[PDB]
Design a protein around this ligand. Sequence first.
Ligand SMILES: [Cl-]
Ligand SMILES: [Cl-]
Ligand SMILES: [Cl-]
Ligand SMILES: [Cl-]
Ligand SMILES: [Cl-]
Ligand SMILES: [Fe+3]
Ligand SMILES: [Fe+3]
Ligand SMILES: [Mg+2]
Ligand SMILES: [Mg+2]
Ligand SMILES: [Mg+2]
Ligand SMILES: [Mg+2]
Ligand SMILES: [Mg+2]
Ligand SMILES: [Mg+2]
Length: 174
Amino acid sequence: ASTSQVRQNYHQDSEAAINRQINLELYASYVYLSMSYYFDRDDVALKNFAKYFLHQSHEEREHAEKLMKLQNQRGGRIFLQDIKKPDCDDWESGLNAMECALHLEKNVNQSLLELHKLATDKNDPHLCDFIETHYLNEQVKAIKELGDHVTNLRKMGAPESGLAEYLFDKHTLG
Ligand SMILES: [Cl-]
Ligand SMILES: [Cl-]
Ligand SMILES: [Cl-]
Ligand SMILES: [Cl-]
Ligand SMILES: [Cl-]
Ligand SMILES: [Fe+3]
Ligand SMILES: [Fe+3]
Ligand SMILES: [Mg+2]
Ligand SMILES: [Mg+2]
Ligand SMILES: [Mg+2]
Ligand SMILES: [Mg+2]
Ligand SMILES: [Mg+2]
Ligand SMILES: [Mg+2]
C-alpha cells in the first residue's frame, strides 16, 4: 500500500489496462509464431509466409516489451497472466492465415482504442501520446497491409489455386 516515487497522474485503471494490453501483445506474438511454423511444414512449404509471420511474431514481442517499459516508467507494477495458445491449430491456407492475422490486428487495435478512451477519461495526456505514437498508426498500417494481402490472394484465386499462394509467396512476401 506504499506508492512509487516516480508515479504521477497514473490511474490504477490505466495500470490494469496496460497489464491486459501486455498479455494481448504476447498472445499476438504467440499466434504469429504458430502461423509461422505452419508454413514451415513439409506439406505447406511456403518459406516466405513462414518468414513473414515470424517477423510479425518478433514485432509483437517488441510491442509487449515497450508496454512493460512504460508500466515501469509511470511507476505502475507489471502483472503477467498465462499466454493462451492460439485459437487455430490448423490454418488450412495462406489466405486463411492472413484473414486470421487481419482479425487479430483488428482485435489488438480495438483493445488499444479502448485503452486510449480510458487514458482520455483519466486525463492522462502522456499515456494518450504514448499509445498514438507507438501503437495506433502501427496498427492502421498493419491492418491495411493484411487487407492488401488478403485482397491479392482472393483476386489471384486462393485458396483453391495452390499456384496463387506459391506466386504470392515469391512476389509479395519475397
Ligand atoms: Cl498517480
Ligand atoms: Cl488511482
Ligand atoms: Cl494467469
Ligand atoms: Cl503512415
Ligand atoms: Cl520474378
Ligand atoms: Fe501489437
Ligand atoms: Fe514470376
Ligand atoms: Mg525447413
Ligand atoms: Mg505487425
Ligand atoms: Mg485454455
Ligand atoms: Mg490528443
Ligand atoms: Mg501527440
Ligand atoms: Mg514522442
